C-alpha cells in the first residue's frame, strides 16, 4: 500500500465518504481523516434520517462496514476501532451490511494479511488441492507448538518469548578462560528501589560456570553477610530469591532463565572476550510474566471440513510426452528464424536421460502436436523426477546460436505420489538475467500466475487407471530381489570423504563407491558422495539405496545440510537430512544457518514436507528464530516464484505465533511508513534540492501519526532492542544517491545507560541487501571458527537485514570512520599525496597511554581477519571509503553488495598505511617482528577456513535458488575452490596464499 488512498499519500484533514446503506440510498458523509469507524457509523445513521426510506434501517448496532482495499479485497471491517485512514481504502466509500460469520476470525485474518503483505482470503480461492491440504495439514504442527509452550506456564511461555541466547557448547577455549581470574568472573548485579526509581549495584566474583540461580545465591549471600543467619535461615532466603527473581541484561530484553552455565550465555561469553563488565539487573518474575499477555490458538474455519490404482512398476512402456502448442510468445518474426521447445527429464541437476526437442517451427505458428520419446522406462522413474522444458529461438549463419525464451518445470509425480496424466497447460517464467543455458532445472516447479505470459500446453499418457509410486513395502523387496573386509580400498574411501562437495568425482570412483556401498556406513561422511554415484534412472539401484539410507548413521548438521541443496531431491534422502537437524542442530546454529535453511525450502518439491514442518515447528517454539523466520520469508513476498509457498507458510506462522504478531505488525507498519517516505524522496523529489528534502523529512517525521508508528517498537535487526522515542535532532538523509535514512532512537530500558543510550540504524530503499546479509553472515561464521580454534581475530559482522525487494536495515557502528575519512584528518606529504602515517597518528591520538598496545593488537588482529576473509571470498579490492576502523582500533569492511555490482587488481588490501600501524610506525615495516607474527596470523586463519571449506561450500550451494545473480550455478562457487586451493594439498595451498600475500604487499 503506497498511501491511505489509491494514488494518494495521505488523506486531507476532512474528506467526503460515499456511504451505501442497506436501503438503496447513498449518503455523502464529511468525516475527519482520523475518524474511527465507530464514529463514522454513528454519525452516518444520524445523518441517514435526512434521507428517504429511513424506516427500513435496523438499529446501528446491527450493521458493520465493508469496502474495497488497495489490495482489491472486499474487507469486512469488524474491528470498528480503526481509523478511516488506516483501512488502506481503494476509494473513499463504505457499504453497510449485516455482519456474518465469526467476528474474531475475520478480525484476526486482517491482522495476518497486513503482516504477510497479502490478504488471506486469496488462499481460500485457490483451486489447487495441494494448497488447501497444506493449510489444513500443518495446523497440527501449530497445535503441537502452542500446546508445548503453554505446558509449564508461565515459565514455558517466557522460554518461548525470551529464549536463552547461549553458545552451542559450555566449553570455553582456553584463550577465553585465560581472561578469567583463576577461573572466576566479576559481575555486577543491579536493583531499582521504587520511591524514585533509584539504582543500586552489588559487585560479585563467581566461578564462570555458575548457573543464574547460583549467581542469585552469591548475591543474597553477599548482602546477608552481617545479618547473623544460620545455615538454614540463609537457605530459606536463598530459596526465596532463587524462586522469586531472575536476571536480566541491563539495556536490552535478554533474560537468564534455563540454568546454562553462566559463561555459556553469549552476552557473558563476550564480556569475557572483550574483558568488559557484565552488568545484570535482578528482576521480579511476576513483573516479567506480567508483560506476557496470554495468547490462544483458535483453529481456523478451513481447518475442519470439505464438502482402483496401479503401481508405476507395472507400466511396461517407455516414457513419452506430447507437446501441443504455445501462446503469447514474444519473438521478432524477421530477426528470429524459428522456434522449438527443448525438454529433459531431470533428477536434481543430472539428466535422467538424453534431452529431446520438438521440430523447429515458424515463430508465427507455435504449434507442434509432437509426442517426444525419452530413453527411460516408466518404472525406472525415481520419485523426484521432474520435467524441465523451455521455448527456444534460433538464428543461423559463423555458428548458429540458440537462446531460451521462457522456461518451466513440472513434477512428474504430485504430492499424492500419483503420476501425471492427461492434458496440462502451464504458463512459463521469464529467463533469469544472465542465464544462457537452454533449460533451468534449478528453477521452481509450477505455472506462472502472471497473466498474458507464454502458456505451453502438453499431454501425458493416460494409462487405463490412476498410477501411483510404489509403497516402500515393495521397494525393499525389490532390493532383496536385485541384490541377488578389504584394506587398501579402505584408505581410498576415507580419502574420498575428505574431498569437498564440489570435487571432481570420476566414473571409476563413483561406481567404486557403489560397489563398496555397504562398507560406506563405516564412514558416514561419504553419504553425499555415494548418493551422487547412484544411477537414479535404475529402479534397481534406487531401491537398494533406499535400504542403505534407512539405516544410515546420523551425520552432523554441517554435513546434513548439503543433502538439502538442489542436488539431492529424493524425499527419503532429504528426510534423513531433516532428522539429523532436529536431533543435532542447536537453536543457536539453526538461528545461524536460518538464511540457507529458508532458501532450501524453494528446492522442496511439494508444499508439505519434512523440512518446512521442522522449521515451522522451531519457529513457533523459539520466538528468536521465529522473528527472523518471519522476516526472511516476508522479505521475498514480492517474488511471485515463491509468494504462494512462503505466503501459506507465513499464514500458519502468524496464526500460531501468539501475541507476538501484534509486535510484528508494528514493525511492518514502521517499515511501510519509511518505505513510502523514501519513495517520495526518490520518485517525487529527485528534481529538488538537498535542503528541500531535509525540510520535508523533518516536517513529515514531525507528524503525530508518523511518530506514534515509528516510536515504541522492537528493532527488526535484534528484537531484544526496544526502539523508543526518536532523536529527530539526529535523523537525516544521507549523501548516497539512493538517499537512505540515518535514524536514531532512544533506548527506553530502565538502565539503558549501561549498554547504549541511543540506537541508530540506516534504512535504505533501492539496494539489494541479501548480498551483504550473506557476506556478513559468512564473516560471522569465519570469526566463530577462528575463536573456537584460539585465533582471537575480531570481525565486525554488523547487523543487516533485507525486509523486501531492495530494501532493509543496516546497523550503524558507533565511534568509527572510514580510512578515507581518516586520511582527510591528516595532511599531505608527497606532492599531492596523503601522509601514510596519518592512520597510525590518529590511532595514537585516540589511544593515548598504556591502551596503545591494545589498539595495535586489535587493529592487527581485525586486519588479519579481513585480509584473509576478503581474499577467500573475492572481496579484496576495496576502496579506502569501503574500509572502516573504530576509535577502539577495530577494522572492518562495509558495503559488500556495492562492490559486487561495481565489478560489473590486488588479492586483498594490505596498504602501506596498515603496515605503519601494524609495525607501530617503523621503517621498512615489512621486516619487523610485529609484521612477522601478523602474516603468521593470516596463514593460520587461512588454513583454519580451509579446514572448514565444506561448510562454506554447502552454505553457498544452498543459496543457488535465491535469485541472487552472484549465485546462479555451481560454477559461480568454483571461485572459492581456487582461493582455498582445494585441488591442491596443504603446503601447496599455504605457498599459494603466501604468494598472494607478497602480491598484496605490492612487492617483496
Amino acid at each position: 500500500s503506497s498511501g491511505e488512498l489509491w494514488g494518494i499519500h495521505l488523506m486531507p484533514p476532512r474528506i467526503l465518504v460515499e456511504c451505501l446503506l442497506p436501503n438503496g440510498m447513498i449518503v455523502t458523509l464529511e468525516c475527519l481523516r482520523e475518524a474511527t469507524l465507530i464514529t463514522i457509523k454513528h454519525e452516518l445513521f444520524k445523518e441517514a434520517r435526512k434521507y428517504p426510506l429511513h424506516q427500513l434501517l435496523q438499529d446501528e448496532s446491527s450493521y458493520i462496514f465493508v469496502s474495497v482495499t488497495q489490495e482489491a479485497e472486499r474487507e469486512e471491517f469488524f474491528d470498528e476501532t480503526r481509523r478511516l485512514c488506516d483501512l488502506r481504502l481503494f476509494q473513499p466509500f463504505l457499504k453497510v451490511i449485516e455482519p456474518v460469520g465469526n467476528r474474531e476470525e475475520k478480525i484476526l485474518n486482517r491482522e495476518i494479511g497486513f503482516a504477510i503483505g497479502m490478504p488471506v482470503c486469496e488462499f481460500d480461492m485457490v483451486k489447487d488441492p495441494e494448497v488447501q491440504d497444506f493449510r489444513r495439514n500443518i495446523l497440527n504442527v501449530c497445535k503441537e507448538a502452542v500446546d508445548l509452550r503453554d505446558l509449564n506456564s508461565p515459565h514455558s511461555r517466557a522460554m518461548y518469548v525470551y529464549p536463552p541466547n547461549v553458545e552451542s557448547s559450555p566449553e570455553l577455549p582456553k584463550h577465553i578462560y585465560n581472561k578469567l581470574d583463576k577461573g572466576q568472573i566479576i559481575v555486577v548485579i543491579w536493583v531499582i528501589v521504587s520511591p524514585n526509581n533509584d539504582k543500586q549495584k552489588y559487585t560479585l566474583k563467581i566461578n564462570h560456570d555458575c548457573v543464574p540461580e547460583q549467581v542469585i545465591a552469591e548475591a543474597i549471600r553477599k548482602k546477608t553477610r552481617s545479618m547473623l543467619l544460620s545455615s538454614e535461615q540463609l537457605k530459606l532466603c536463598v530459596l526465596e530469591y532463587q524462586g522469586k527473581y531472575i536476571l536480566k541484561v541491563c539495556g536490552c530484553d535478554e533474560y537468564f532463565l534455563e540454568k546454562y552455565p553462566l559463561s555459556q550465555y553469549k552476552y557473558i561469553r563476550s564480556c569475557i572476550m572483550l574483558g568488559r563488565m557484565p552488568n545484570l539487573m535482578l528482576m521480579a518474575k511476576e513483573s516479567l510474566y506480567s508483560q506476557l499477555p496470554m495468547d490462544c490458538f483458535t483453529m481456523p474455519s478451513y481447518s475442519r471440513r470439505i464438502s482402483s490404482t496401479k503401481s508405476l512398476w507395472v507400466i511396461n512402456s517407455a516414457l513419452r510426452i506430447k507437446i501441443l502448442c504455445a501462446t503469447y510468445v514474444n519473438v521478432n518474426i524477421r530477426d528470429i528464424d524459428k522456434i522449438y521447445v527443448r525438454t529433459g527429464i531431470y533428477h536434481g541437476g543430472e539428466p535422467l536421460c538424453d534431452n529431446v526437442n520438438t521440430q523447429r517451427v515458424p515463430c508465427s505458428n507455435p504449434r507442434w502436436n509432437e509426442w517426444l520419446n525419452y530413453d527411460i522406462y516408466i518404472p525406472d522413474l525415481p520419485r523426484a523426477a521432474r520435467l524441465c522444458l523451455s521455448i527456444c529461438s534460433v538464428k543461423g549463419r559463423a555458428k548458429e546460436e540458440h537462446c531460451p525464451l521462457a522456461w518451466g518445470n513440472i513434477n512428474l509425480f504430485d504430492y499424492t505420489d500419483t503420476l501425471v496424466s492427461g492434458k496440462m497447460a502451464l504458463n512459463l517464467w521469464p529467463v533469469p538475467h544472465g542465464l544462457e543455458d537452454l533449460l533451468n532445472p534449478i528453477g521452481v516447479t509450477g505455472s506462472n500466475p502472471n497473466k498474458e505470459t507464454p502458456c505451453l500446453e502438453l499431454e501425458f499418457d493416460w494409462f487405463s487407471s490412476v498410477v501411483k509410486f510404489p509403497d516402500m513395502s515393495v521397494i525393499e523387496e525389490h532390493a532383496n530381489w536385485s541384490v541377488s573386509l578389504r584394506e587398501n580400498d579402505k584408505e581410498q574411501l576415507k580419502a574420498i570423504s575428505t574431498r569437498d562437495p564440489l570435487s571432481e568425482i570420476t566414473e571409476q570412483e563413483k561406481d567404486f563407491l557403489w560397489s563398496h556401498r555397504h562398507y560406506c556406513v563405516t564412514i558416514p561422511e561419504i553419504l553425499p558422495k555415494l548418493l551422487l554415484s547412484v544411477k537414479w534412472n535404475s529402479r534397481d539401484e534406487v531401491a537398494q539405496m533406499y535400504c542403505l539410507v534407512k539405516d544410515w548413521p546420523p551425520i552432523k548438521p554441517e554435513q546434513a545440510m548439503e543433502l538439502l541443496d538442489c542436488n539431492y531431491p529424493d524425499p527419503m534422502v532429504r528426510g534423513f537430512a531433516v532428522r539429523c537437524l532436529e536431533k543435532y542442530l542447536t537453536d543457536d546454529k539453526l538461528s545461524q544457518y536460518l538464511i540457507q535453511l529458508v532458501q532450501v525450502l524453494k528446492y522442496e518439491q511439494y508444499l508439505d514436507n519434512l523440512l518446512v514442518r521442522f522449521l515451522l515447528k522451531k519457529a513457533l517454539t523459539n520466538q528468536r528464530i521465529g522473528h527472523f523466520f518471519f522476516w526472511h520469508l516476508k522479505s521475498e513476498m514480492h517474488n511471485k516464484t515463491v509468494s504462494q509457498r512462503f505466503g501459506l507458510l507465513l499464514e500458519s506462522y502468524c496464526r500460531a505465533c501468539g501475541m507476538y504478531l501484534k509486535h510484528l505488525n508494528r514493525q511492518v507498519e514502521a517499515m511501510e511508513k519509511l518505505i513510502n517516505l523514501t519513495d517520495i524522496l526518490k520518485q517525487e523529489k529527485k528534481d529538488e534540492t538537498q535542503k528541500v528534502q531535509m525540510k520535508f523529512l523533518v516536517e513529515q517525521m514531525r507528524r503525530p501519526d508518523f511518530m506514534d508508528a515509528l516510536q515504541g517498537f522492537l528493532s527488526p535487526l535484534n528484537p531484544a532492542h526496544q526502539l523508543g522515542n526518536l532523536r529527530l535532532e539526529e535523523c537525516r538523509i544521507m549523501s548516497s544517491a539512493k538517499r537512505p535514512l540515518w535514524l536514531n532512537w532512544e533506548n527506553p530500558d530502565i538502565m539503558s545507560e549501561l549498554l547504549f543510550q541511543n540506537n541508530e540504524i540506516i534504512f535504505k530503499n533501492g539496494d539489494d541487501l541479501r548480498q551483504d546479509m550473506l557476506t556478513l553472515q559468512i564473516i560471522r561464521i569465519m570469526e566463530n571458527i577462528w575463536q573456537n580454534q584460539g585465533l582471537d581475530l575480531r570481525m565486525l559482522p554488523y547487523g543487516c537485514l533485507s525486509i523486501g525487494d531492495c530494501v532493509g536495515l543496516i546497523e550503524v557502528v558507533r565511534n568509527s570512520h572510514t580510512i578515507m575519512q581518516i586520511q582527510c584528518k591528516g595532511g599531505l606529504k608527497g606532492a599531492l599525496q596523503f601522509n601514510s602515517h596519518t592512520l597510525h597518528q590518529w590511532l595514537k591520538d585516540k589511544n593515548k597511554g598504556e591502551i596503545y598496545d591494545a589498539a595495535i593488537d586489535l587493529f592487527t588482529r581485525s586486519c588479519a581477519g579481513y585480509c584473509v576473509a576478503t581474499f577467500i571470498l573475492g572481496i579484496g579490492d576495496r576502496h579506502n571509503s569501503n574500509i572502516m576502523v573504530k576509535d577502539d582500533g577495530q577494522l572492518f569492511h562495509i558495503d559488500f553488495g556495492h562492490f559486487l555490482d561495481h565489478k560489473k587488481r590486488v588479492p586483498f588490501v594490505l596498504t602501506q598505511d596498515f603496515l605503519i600501524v601494524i609495525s607501530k610506525g617503523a621503517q621498512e615495516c615489512t621486516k619487523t617482528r610485529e609484521f612477522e607474527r601478523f602474516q603468521e596470523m593470516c596463514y593460520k586463519a587461512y588454513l583454519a577456513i580451509r579446514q572448514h571449506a565444506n561448510l562454506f561450500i554447502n552454505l553457498f550451494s544452498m543459496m543457488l535458488g535465491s535469485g541472487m545473480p552472484e549465485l546462479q550455478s555451481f560454477d559461480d562457487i568454483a571461485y572459492i575452490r581456487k582461493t582455498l586451493a582445494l585441488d591442491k594439498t596443504e603446503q601447496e595451498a599455504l605457498e599459494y596464499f603466501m604468494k598472494q600475500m607478497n602480491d598484496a604487499r605490492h612487492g617483496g
Binding site: I26, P52, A72, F93, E504
Partner: protein, 272 residues
C-alpha cells in the same frame, strides 16, 4: 603421436571451461585435459553421454597408459584412438559410446585476412566496443522490462479493485430498485411527487457516481492495454538482442587467439 599437437588435448583448462564446451552437445563428443590437480603426467578425459559430462581418470604407470587397474597403452593417443575405433562398452557395458567427435584447440580461428597485428590492435578493439554497447542496451532493456512488469501488476490489481467497487455499486442499484419500487408506487397514488423526487434525486446521484468510476476503470484499462503492448515489445527486442550478444562475445573472445599467437599481454596493453 604428439599429445601436445592432438586435436582433443586442450590441457590447462578448468572443469567450468569444459562444461562450457560440452553444453548440449551430442553423445560421443569428448575432450581431454591434464588433471585439475595440475600434477604432471596425470590426465582426465570427459565425454558426453546421456546429457551428462562423465569424467574418467587416465592412470599412468611405467610409461604405460590406461584408465583401469590393468594398464596397457604406450601413449594417450594410442589409448584415445583405440576407443575412437571401438566402443567403451569394453570398459562399462552401460557406456556403449565411442569417442566419436573431438573438439579441438585451433580448428576455429575465424581470422581471414593478412595477419597484420591490427587484428587485435584494431578489430578486437572494435568487436569489444561492439559487445559492450550491445551489452549495455540489453541491460537497459531488462531494467525497463522489470519496471514495466511491476507497473503492470499494479494496474492489474487496480482494475481488479475497480471490479469489486463496481460490483458493490451495482448491487446497490439492484437493492435500491428492490426496496424503493413499492414505496415509489405507494407515493404515486398519494400524489406525493415531492418524496418520489427525493428518491429519484438520490438514485440519479448513485448512478451518476457509478458512471464516474466506470469511466475511471476503462481509462485505466486503456493505460494497461497500451502498457501491456510495449511490454511485449521490450521482450521481443531482448530476445532479438540475446543471440547477437552471444555471437559477438564468442567472436570477441576467440579473437584473443591472435593475442595468444603473440603469447603475452604486451598487445592488449595497447588497449589499456
Amino acid at each position: 603421436m604428439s599429445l601436445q599437437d592432438a586435436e582433443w588435448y586442450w590441457g590447462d583448462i578448468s572443469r567450468e571451461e569444459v562444461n562450457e564446451k560440452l553444453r548440449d552437445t551430442a553423445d560421443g563428443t569428448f575432450l581431454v585435459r591434464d588433471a585439475s590437480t595440475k600434477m604432471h603426467g596425470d590426465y582426465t578425459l570427459t565425454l558426453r553421454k546421456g546429457g551428462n559430462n562423465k569424467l574418467i581418470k587416465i592412470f599412468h604407470r611405467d610409461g604405460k597408459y590406461g584408465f583401469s587397474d590393468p594398464l596397457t597403452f604406450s601413449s594417450v593417443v594410442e589409448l584415445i584412438n583405440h576407443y575412437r575405433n571401438e566402443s567403451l562398452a569394453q570398459y562399462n557395458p552401460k557406456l556403449d559410446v565411442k569417442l566419436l567427435y573431438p573438439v579441438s584447440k585451433y580448428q576455429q580461428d575465424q581470422v581471414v585476412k593478412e595477419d597484420n597485428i591490427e587484428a587485435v590492435g584494431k578489430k578486437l578493439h572494435e568487436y569489444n566496443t561492439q559487445f559492450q554497447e550491445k551489452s549495455r542496451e540489453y541491460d537497459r532493456l531488462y531494467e525497463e522490462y522489470t519496471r514495466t512488469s511491476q507497473e503492470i501488476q499494479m494496474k492489474r490489481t487496480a482494475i481488479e479493485a475497480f471490479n469489486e467497487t463496481i460490483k458493490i455499486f451495482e448491487e446497490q442499484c439492484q437493492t435500491q430498485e428492490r426496496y424503493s419500487k413499492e414505496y415509489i408506487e405507494k407515493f404515486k397514488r398519494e400524489g406525493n411527487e415531492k418524496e418520489i423526487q427525493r428518491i429519484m434525486h438520490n438514485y440519479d446521484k448513485l448512478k451518476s457516481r457509478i458512471s464516474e468510476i466506470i469511466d475511471s476503470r476503462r481509462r485505466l484499462e486503456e493505460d494497461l492495454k497500451k502498457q501491456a503492448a510495449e511490454y511485449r515489445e521490450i521482450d521481443k527486442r531482448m530476445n532479438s538482442i540475446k543471440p547477437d550478444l552471444i555471437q559477438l562475445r564468442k567472436t570477441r573472445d576467440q579473437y584473443l587467439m591472435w593475442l595468444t599467437q603473440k603469447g603475452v599481454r604486451q598487445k592488449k596493453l595497447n588497449e589499456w
